[PDB]
Amino acid sequence: PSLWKGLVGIGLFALAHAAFSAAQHRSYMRLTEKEDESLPIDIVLQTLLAFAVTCYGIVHIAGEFKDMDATSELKNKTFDTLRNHPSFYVFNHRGRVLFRP
């Protein structure tokens, strides 16, 4: 369904928010200068979950596969279509006379 597309959007948004959080946390260190050297569990969990949902949505957004066997889409092609030959059309048929000229 189309909602899949919407899903991926929020995923990116989630990732974007993670970035902001990470940036802020970096400022934290740039003002604390302590031996933490570790991201908050909340931000990494949020980033990983956003990655998972965004990838799952993207896989759907990629599209639908197509079968290799050439007789798949040609199965429904009745003989009433392949014979038309659009380049070799002739307009000397009963259609013109029968219909309004």
Partner 1 sequence: SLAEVVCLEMVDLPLTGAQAELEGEFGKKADGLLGMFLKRLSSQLILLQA
- For residue 29, state whether it binds ligand PCW (rule: CB under 6 A): no
Among 1-9, 13-21, 44-52, 84-92, which window interacts with ligand PCW (CB under 6 A)?
Answer: 13-21
- Binding partner 1 by CB under 8 A: which of 2, 32, 76, 87? 32
* Footprint of partner 1 on 46-65 (CB under 8 A): 46
- Given a contact cutoff of 8 angstroms between Cβ atoms, the answer to whether 4 and 32 are in contact is no
- For residue 13, state whether it binds ligand PCW (rule: CB under 6 A): no
b or e along 57-71 (b: 16 or more beta carbons within 10 Å of the residue's beta carbon)? beeeeeeeeeeeeee
**Nearest one of 48, 62, 40, 38 to 14, comparing CA atoms:** 48
Give 20 or 28: the residue with its C-beta nearer to ligand PCW. 20
Backbone angles phi, psi at 71, to 5 degrees: -85, 20
- For residue 6, state whether it binds partner 1 (rule: CB under 8 A): no
Q: In this structure, how many other beta carbons lie within 10 angstroms of the beta carbon of residue 18?
A: 20
Give 27 or 72: the residue with its C-beta nearer to partner 1. 27
Give 13 or 20: the residue with its C-beta nearer to ligand PCW. 20
